[PDB]
Design a binder for this molecule. Structure first.
Ligand SMILES: NS(=O)(=O)c1ncc[nH]1
Length: 126
């Protein structure tokens, strides 16, 4: 079902949360080799999450589930904010700009925390 596809998508999102929090610790500790690997892992996780979300939205559209479409449009918009901030964080790591990396890190944390009430609303709507 679309609801079980959303449970799979949620789990991938939680995997990225876990990897992110480990990466944050590695960044603080100066373990740049670990950070590089975690950023690669996060890129794959976000790419996969984005795809699962698009399939969920497309299915809700085909089902005529107007409320779920509305919530998923808002949620997919917020996802792209996080993706842009993530990608900027990656560039800051490449460039050795630790000040920008810290900045983007906190921003990605706040954008993600903000979107959690909507994430729970979607589960109930599908
Ligand atoms: N936790 S998150 O939803 O922003 C996510 N999923 C994949 C990469 N990042």
């Amino acid at each position: 079902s679309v609801k079980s596809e959303y449970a799979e998508a949620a789990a991938v999102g939680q995997e990225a949360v876990a990897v992110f929090n480990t990466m944050k610790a590695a960044f603080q500790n100066g373990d740049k080799e670990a950070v590089a690997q975690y950023l690669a892992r996060l890129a794959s996780l976000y790419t996969r999450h984005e795809e699962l979300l698009n399939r969920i939205l497309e299915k809700a559209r085909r089902e005529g589930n107007k409320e779920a479409v509305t919530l998923m449009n808002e949620f997919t918009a917020t996802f792209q904010t996080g993706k842009s901030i993530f990608n900027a964080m990656v560039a800051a790591f490449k460039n050795g700009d630790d000040d920008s990396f810290e900045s983007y890190l906190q921003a990605l944390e706040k954008v993600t925390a903000k979107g959690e009430t909507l994430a729970d609303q979607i589960a109930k709507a599908l």
